[PDB]
Ligand binder design. Structure first.
Ligand SMILES: *[B@@]1([O])OC2=C(C([O])=O)[C]=[C][C]=C2[C][C]1[N]C(=O)[C][C]1[C][C][C]([N][C][C][N])[C][C]1
Ligand SMILES: *[B@@]1([O])OC2=C(C([O])=O)[C]=[C][C]=C2[C][C]1[N]C(=O)[C][C]1[C][C][C]([N][C][C][N])[C][C]1
Ligand SMILES: [Cl-]
Ligand SMILES: [Cl-]
Ligand SMILES: [Cl-]
Ligand SMILES: [Cl-]
Ligand SMILES: [Cl-]
Ligand SMILES: [Cl-]
Ligand SMILES: [Cl-]
Ligand SMILES: [Cl-]
Ligand SMILES: [Cl-]
Ligand SMILES: [Cl-]
Ligand SMILES: [Cl-]
Ligand SMILES: [Cl-]
Lengths: 246, 245
């Protein structure tokens, strides 16, 4: 969403770490968002592994993914990361961002069905050019932090163009922290270290349920070195702690 | 299914002088291990562990309208301060808000309640003693083995309820989330009991890890609230020593 306001007091967490990024935090009850940088909140970036959220819903809706108990078998051939070399459930693949698992899902979904669902979802620029199994990693697909929070709100309310059962399945898989006072659903993303003078992007998106309130958030930053990855969680976490949400 | 005794876990009980049982089953309930065969099948007051089937029944009957329903507090005194506030379904389950589920049970009614406990094969299915308290001081009894069987059905979406409603309840039961494993669980506590008849404390749930699942159920005699943390520390130590964590 209903409104958005700039809160430049959040810039302290960024400049303390020398990070160029944006944080968007929306309070569901009031339909109001706050961000440290309006301009970057609307800038569109490669979603990277955050795309595993819509990709998982689409895989379920199309039947490519049978259910949350399907085991994605490893065929024993080398993968890019050791943590991907094992059988995985849907949650396990999401948790380790198992690219080849979701590349296979995308191929089976196909270009036509993928295009349909991103229009239904209003997901970014909806441009899936560049290869059916790479458009979210190195293609032309772009999405903003504001779009991410809007998309995640629809998922939370089960308002996406998909069965409630399938949206619930994917929500169960995104739980990342459970405390007595609150519950966190989130997904990380990382496009890489980018080229010279053209850094990559790192994401952290999700929502926080605390008491009877719901907070949707989206963070992204420029990243040129793999070691800066933890900042995509520490900076949002510190902001949300300063807001009393933890 | 068969129940197998595991004598090595008794060390955790004896160090604390606790009379209780731990049941742990990998993959399924077909083969469960325990420290005490007799107590593993002994039926006890379920206490607040009954909020699991009660929540499923509330959703199946429409008493609970949807996953996002807020249980408003009318402002009048409740036994515990953590209950004196508006609560979601997860919130009510996490603080064990008795008043919320008492009203749910009253709206469900005895006939529908009996129907669903028969479908769930939930313990002795005896709901006598008051619709808003048969699980707290009534005749309902359930064993650790029965709890594991019931939790396995819920895990598989095999209970007599929509998969949607079972998913809603499972989401409300998440208590620990780590990159390596996910824990769903619920605590229970009937009180300190009468003279020579102690209360019961519960911890039941399951652990999802790699491509494997582990179902567990713990109960213990309790006559002093100071012993309550043992209901999680004993099973936690056992599951830690087994590498489940
Ligand atoms: B995805 O963006 O998510 C992801 C993360 C994450 O959640 O931030 C961490 C590690 C891998 C992945 C897979 C997806 N990202 C990529 O595929 C880009 C790729 C991943 C591996 C990196 N290897 C560094 C060199 N040793 C290079 C970029
Ligand atoms: B329920 O069993 O869950 C519950 C727990 C728990 O998670 O085990 C802890 C505290 C309260 C509750 C509510 C439900 N149990 C009861 O209503 C019986 C009540 C429990 C507290 C006892 N007094 C302890 C002193 N602080 C007396 C009986
Ligand atoms: Cl909003
Ligand atoms: Cl842009
Ligand atoms: Cl980009
Ligand atoms: Cl790979
Ligand atoms: Cl909560
Ligand atoms: Cl990495
Ligand atoms: Cl990280
Ligand atoms: Cl085991
Ligand atoms: Cl009893
Ligand atoms: Cl009360
Ligand atoms: Cl207490
Ligand atoms: Cl405890």
């Amino acid at each position: 969403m209903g409104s958005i306001t700039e809160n430049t007091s959040w810039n302290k967490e960024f400049s303390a770490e020398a990070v160029n990024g944006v944080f968007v935090l929306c309070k569901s009850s009031s339909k109001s968002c706050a961000t440290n940088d309006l301009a970057r909140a609307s800038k569109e970036y490669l979603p990277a592994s955050t795309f595993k959220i819509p990709n998982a819903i689409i895989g379920l809706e199309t039947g490519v993914i049978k259910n949350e108990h399907q085991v994605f078998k490893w065929d024993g051939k080398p993968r890019a990361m050791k943590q991907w070399e094992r059988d995985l459930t849907l949650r396990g693949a999401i948790q380790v961002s198992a690219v080849p698992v979701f590349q296979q899902i995308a191929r089976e979904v196909g270009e036509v069905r993928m295009q349909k669902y991103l229009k239904k979802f209003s997901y970014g620029n909806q441009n899936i050019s560049g290869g059916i199994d790479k458009f979210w990693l190195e293609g032309q697909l772009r999405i903003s932090a504001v779009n991410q929070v809007e998309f995640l709100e629809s998922l939370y309310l089960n308002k996406l163009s998909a069965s409630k059962e399938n949206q619930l399945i994917v929500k169960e898989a995104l739980v990342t922290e459970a405390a007595p006072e609150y519950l966190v659903h989130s997904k990380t993303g990382f496009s890489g270290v980018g080229t010279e003078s053209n850094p990559g992007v790192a994401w952290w998106v999700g929502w926080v349920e605390k008491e009877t309130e719901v907070y949707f958030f989206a963070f992204n930053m420029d990243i040129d070195n793999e070691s800066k990855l933890p900042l995509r969680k520490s900076i949002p976490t510190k902001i949300m702690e300063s807001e009393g949400i933890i």
